[model samples]
Target: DPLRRTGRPFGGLIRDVRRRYPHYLSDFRDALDPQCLAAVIFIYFAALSPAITFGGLLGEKTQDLIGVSELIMSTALQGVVFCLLGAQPLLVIGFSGPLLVFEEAFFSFCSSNHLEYLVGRVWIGFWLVFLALLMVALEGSFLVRFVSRFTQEIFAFLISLIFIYETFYKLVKIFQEHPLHGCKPRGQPNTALLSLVLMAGTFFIAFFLRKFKNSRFFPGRIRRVIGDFGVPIAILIMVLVDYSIEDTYTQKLSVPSGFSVTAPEKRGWVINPLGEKSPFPVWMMVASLLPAILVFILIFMETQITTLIISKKERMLQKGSGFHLDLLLIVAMGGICALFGLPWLAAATVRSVTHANALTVMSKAVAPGDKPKIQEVKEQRVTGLLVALLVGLSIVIGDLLRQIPLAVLFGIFLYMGVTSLNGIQFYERLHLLLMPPKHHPDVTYVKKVRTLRMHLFTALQLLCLALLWAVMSTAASLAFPFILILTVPLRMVVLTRIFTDREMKCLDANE
Candidate 1:
């Protein structure tokens, strides 16, 4: 198969970079489109806020061993570097929540041992970089072949549902923050109501306009702009609507008043890896090796799996998959980030999928019965580069950006969750569970398999997904990828008993 591994040092990396060399120039040229600008808008909002939010959380954990400024610069600068140099421009790298969770635990281990936080992190960095390179030389990312659509869709649902879960969790917290005790407090009650109204309005308007692409209400060109520019337009309109009401000051998108390290007094911008900032006993450097093994497992699964999801066959992506090349780039970024006391960056599931969806060109509705199909992806480097720059540049637009309410972003969060969710076969199957068998779509899985058997399969998947949520929520999260990888074997070994080869072919074949 074309996806098979080559048995040579850096073979996968070399092959990936070589495949991309043909389209290198077109990457720049193709990005000069209205779609790219819309993508820029979507990704900037999608990627930036979380960086700051998570940075605050991280700063609290380590007392500013790493903070917002580190996150901003790292996310922006690393993104620009990766977009320019990495084989896959479509993958968006962000400072992930999973990494944040790990950092908290990692820091706990360091603080308990009376070790310096960033110093210990730097050693793990070296180990992680070395391990990643070793994998590249061997067959590090050669495991993606084992990740079939069964696990792929399950992973997709895990991520997409995470977005929805976070969205509702954030929105629900509004009332909790601004409680309605006896309805006496005017500001609190009004704020909560305004929050709900604006968030719903943003989702409603954007979803409504998105559907307009198929309507005969306007000429194709005008309607296409409305559809393509849905997220930005909805945000801008809601921002205007939010302020149009005089008294209701719904919470807005938060950014630091000025761009600076969260605790500049404690340490300067750069940590000299071997200098005062490190202050590590030589023995601790060796100890960091064990932790790096865990980190290696995470980046392999998280980063490589995201590449598999994005490089899927159905999308008809022009640029080939680049698991090895991308991992090499990640190793570079990881080392540099450690030197600056910055958060580690990884392939972001929600944002990466959202970026792909942003650049997608749908077939125009010409025939009367036509539902739009994907025409092609406008794959390019500029959108990621531009969004990266804008995230860093957003510190300058502080006041203007402040006016756009969090409610608007929350709406986009929900929009992205639902939009990405709609793409997953697993999610579609969940809908099938509610429908009568006769009403089920005439897809191959439905056609080949009995409804009861399919429901059993769907139930097992749902149970596994729930179990994943449990693992993520508990201390066992460090063991996340371990459990995640086990699903592949479960599909192969356990499902083989219940499902025949024909049924398996119908149900789990990669698109």
Candidate 2:
């Protein structure tokens, strides 16, 4: 019988906490409760922030450097976040790295080529919606079938490489600010170096806290230290240090050289490219949009699939959630954000897991029937408030943000990059290593010894990243690698028969 979902007893705060965190499985199952109110709040915050911040980012000239608003709206309208969250509530929603790169390129292309067609962006927007609707009509979720663990490993790795690209280049710039380098009129780069130092130090401290500090001392030390909190605590420290030292130590951060970052200045409406008023040639439009389309598919697939993994991993809800409803919601949310002029958001596997870890305060989800059990943890709603507050606080603390050592964020990015690579499939990674065994013994031996084709793909993904780094500046080179990330699915569909109904179900359901 279909049970009408209704409210439940509080079970008292103390009981809930104990049951959720208990070492036994029975305690966990009894603690499961759907946090409908919290979930609703999370969606609103996630959708609103990206839409507002990214919309402003896109309206600026950086569309060429990164298609923030355009790309965001395109995929977001697809409700990628909503799908991921609902189909698998354990996953959080955000944007993709490659999508950011594409937005950057689109902005750059428009600025340099003097493309008078400002409305040209809407063309891509409509196309994606059209495609999404077409897919919905034809039940084209199957397209995701072409994406396998191998493809996912490579694509996710490539997308994650953005952090590496961002970190290395930022670090170099931090170094360039040295007084010893006879810095420009911008004053000594002490702030930059300091920023780096702060970044590195905080990251290490956080890492250590997570690793060693987890050990409980005999009867515990006199009160637990707040330093035990890892990423969030580290971020807080980094921000504080930057604020404290930026004016004295480093030059202020540079602003974009164009129209100031502000709210919608005019009420002019962008025309749809498909509905005429487009002066550009067919080839030009195709050339401009092809890359984004490929990227959208790749990111969308990853975002969708990642949500499923998160659901299973975190056990956000009891029954496995269906993708059809989830995808529709995600895409619809994306479209709404577009209508209001906002950046796109994807399934935030990292943030969702973090949110779950913070709130659920229970074991990670491992199966379909495992709904998230509430624990004695802090209020999750407060976490959302905290995130929202932080973003707003950034505006007031904008100057401090500039001071934040590049190294700190870099180290954070580096940690993120390394962690993302962990998703690389074992078999694909092995195959890549076999083809080029000389790069690193440990990597090669891991692949060869494991005898997995999946692991090789990861090695190739890393190899590709290195090649890109050698050829271009980190920011500029990222475009090429990110663009190629889309090709992974193409390879999977044509060459391998790895994907199946079972996998698709796993990907689509539970988040």
Candidate 3:
């Protein structure tokens, strides 16, 4: 299973492409559903807000070398490409943290060595393209077998924590602002509390509406529609709430002051691979491989982990997966992104999960104390196409986007983080450690494995997860993917010593 030789050259890729080809027309047909429309609006803002955040941050770091234009273009075009052609269209691609880490370091590296930032970055991108394709040809993607739910759950948790962490971190920054960060002695305005109020209001409305499907008051169709539109409706109401309060000094989303035709006419469309300013010497081309391997690792781990989440048996996606073909698209687009001096994109875990959750079709619980089950995931390409389509269209609607409060988005983020936790088994097991044995949920793992043994495994995973969180914020974060690889051996080798085959089966069987 670790190697695929069944198909020539691209192996799994060609097979995936061939399989999905017949469904191309249906993929569009299915997207006509109103659920897909709700998902499009939900995901579009989630996609654009981060692009805006990182655009400003990346601009600050690179001294305006790359801005919203590059970030938006890279995110928008790549999502379009992947949605139209990649094996799994539900996997939302965007400018992720790891990709951001690599670019930040590379920019710093360029500055230190008196080299052109885009020049060496372009070289690194080319290396990623070539190596990514080589691995697909060699069937290297099957190495994903080494990454099971243990690592997948941890990585997913990290993304969730990021959402929660960013929300809190931004709120704390608001409190730190002097007299509300320059409101002129404005005499003790409690802008911070107002922001928090807006944050909680946004989260409460969305969470309640998402659960409204289970409520008795509304008819099933109306409840389902409201639940499906929970986030968008919550956001719109919260925006109106903020507007009613009038300049609470709370932070609001701002599409960058520059982009498309509105951007300053300072930069060209392409960076000369050979020279521009502080150009690298000829040898730098081959030398770029050093970081390229790491970038590939970052891209590889991220792509596979997010793929594993979306393609998990629990989600019930019917279209099948393209482990090889997806990488092939990255190879194609990563190179294009390099030439244009744009940000390299990958399957963003938060956005992808949000996208998947948005289209989830759930069945009602049949009995008391039972929760709803995921009956199906509306897997189709057109929703992703339109979400990114809206991302590009945001350049024209920048002013309207700027009106939505950042507190409200972070509130939705908090909602996203907490809800995402419901899907991870680790979240369940960790809680079982504190719950009385009789109170534990009757999931298969809890039913079979002793509570103590479950605790042992959960404790170790917690340790590993905490370690990852520590490193993820440091200067060493560029190596986060490399560091995450440690869990493989921990699970495959050491974990075997601590738990029996039966125990492992109950706790870690294939999903």
Candidate 4:
């Protein structure tokens, strides 16, 4: 296959880099612009807040088993280095839910077995890197071709749902905790109302700004510029609003003080796969690969689906793909993060899309029945480079990070999750169940597939989505990748029986 033939072993890798070098050179030169710089600033905070919020949560869960502080460092390292060296700098890397669950599960297993946590983690990291290298050598990423739009939409929808659900859940929880303000004896001035207002206000404003270009209100250039910086500007507006409110404060992010690349523990900087003072058992190394395989699959699906989303044909990206090459870099980074006990990072769909959209300048207007097309994306490393720089500076300005309301970040997350729902046919079709027959969306599935067949297919996809969500939410989350991959074969075999190839195509084709 051409995919396998393109890049192979050690020397093939170097050749691939040489081929991409010019693009990097051109990318650097064209990467700097007022528009691109604004994107960098917006995305920097957009991406940073989530990492800190999730990292802190993970740390709280593991009681420091996986360092939240280290997550910040890991994001800095991966975001910075990957922007410089990765084959596809457009794919923003960061902490993910699956990895967080796996880390906790592995730690629990080690604890139960009375094994040194670091030692077990190190071996899994080694196995992850080894398997990733093996995949590259075999050009296994080509297997993504088998993943139809059914799978991609479901996966992407699941991820976006996570962002949306978490954003709302956190805001609601805040309201539950503080129902009244200074007027009551039991309650002081509370941030709940402020948080709700900020959350809703930010989402509306960001949505308006992001889609402003599509509107006829402003000149095309001014609208495009405003749309490009909309999310960042919205965030800025909310932050300023938050700061100005007297006796009103929302929940803020939890960030550690000072700079430290690794966790503040003895021997945190290195992973000795064998316990520091314990005897090594040969079977243990072999046994670890079982779980390692699952982790590897999780990484594979997570990265590839996000890649597929960004690289969709409709996006009109000019650059060629680097799936195999990017996978190599991800694994290499994974190994290093493992050794240093950092949270495993992967291609995040929401963040990457946000990054791509932030740098993208919309070309054509939306037609009667179509989405607006991208004229060109400012394909540059500046966004990631600046994001990295700010994360590093965050180590010094930790106090400032603490002051940013988590509610504002939640609002951004809601905007991202809601905005992404626009083109996903599955979600659109799912909407059919609620709407009158007279007002259905004018899409392939609705037009080509029978209403009954479409409903059945939507039901099946939802079942798979729910099942995957169940696995991800429970103690069985360790098998998340395994469960995720099962969808491929199930779709290939069983789903084909339920829906004809033509029906499947209508339901699964890329929008």
lDDT of 1 at 97: 68
Candidate 3 regions with alpha-carbon error over 4 angstroms: 1-7, 178-188, 257-266, 277-279, 365-369
Tell me how far the alpha carbon of residue 3 in candidate 4 is from the true structure, in angstroms, after superposition: 3.2
- Model 1, global lDDT: 0.81
Which candidate should be chosen as best, given TM-score against the real structure? Answer: 1
Ordering by TM-score: 1, 3, 4, 2
Per model, how many backbone clashes are there?
A: 0, 60, 0, 0
Model 4, poorest ten-residue lDDT window?
1-10
Instruction: Give the per-residue lDDT digits (tens) of candidate 4, residues 1-511.
Output: 2244554455446555766766876887887677877877767776777777677678676646565567888888887888888777888888877777777777777778777777776788888888888877766677887777877888888888888888778876676677764552224366677777888888889878866767778787787777777777888898899898777545677677765533455545666666677876777878888877777777778888888878777776776666677878887788778887776788888888877776666557445646656678767766788878788677777687777787788777777777777657777777798888778867666788778887888888899999988877786667767677778899888888977889877777755
> What C-alpha lDDT values do all the predictions have?
0.81, 0.46, 0.79, 0.75
**Model 4, global lDDT:** 0.75
> Per-residue CA lDDT of candidate 2, range 282-376, in tens?
65655645643654574466566665444343334444334444454555465445433345556665445445443444433456553335433
Runs of candidate 2 exceeding 4 Å displacement: 1-85, 89-92, 95-97, 104-116, 179-185, 218-228, 235-247, 251-299, 308-319, 339-341, 348-408, 419-511
What does candidate 3's lDDT look like per residue over 422-505, in tens digits? 778888777777878888776899878788888888888889988998998787887688789988988889998888999998
lDDT over C-alpha atoms for residue 157 of model 2: 50
List candidate 4 stretches off by more than 4 Å.
Answer: 1-19, 63-65, 181-187, 261-268, 271-274, 277-283, 364-371, 434-447
Better of 1 and 3 by lDDT: 1
For residues 1-511, what per-residue lDDT tens digits would candidate 1 score against the true structure? 4456777777776777778878988888887788788888888888988987888788888877677777898888899899889888888898776788789998888788887777777778888888877877896576788888878887888887787887899877778878666442433657877888888999999899888866778777888888899888898898888888887557766787676777777887766666475556888868889988887777778887888887777786976767778888887688667877877889998889888877888776567664677779888878888888898888888888777778888888888888887567888888898888779876898988899999998999999999999989997788888988999899889999988999888888876
Alpha-carbon error at 243 in model 2, in Å? 6.4
Candidate 3: pairs in clash: none
- Distance from true location, Cα of 7 in model 2, Å: 34
Better of 2 and 4 by lDDT: 4
Who is ahead in TM-score, 3 or 4?
3
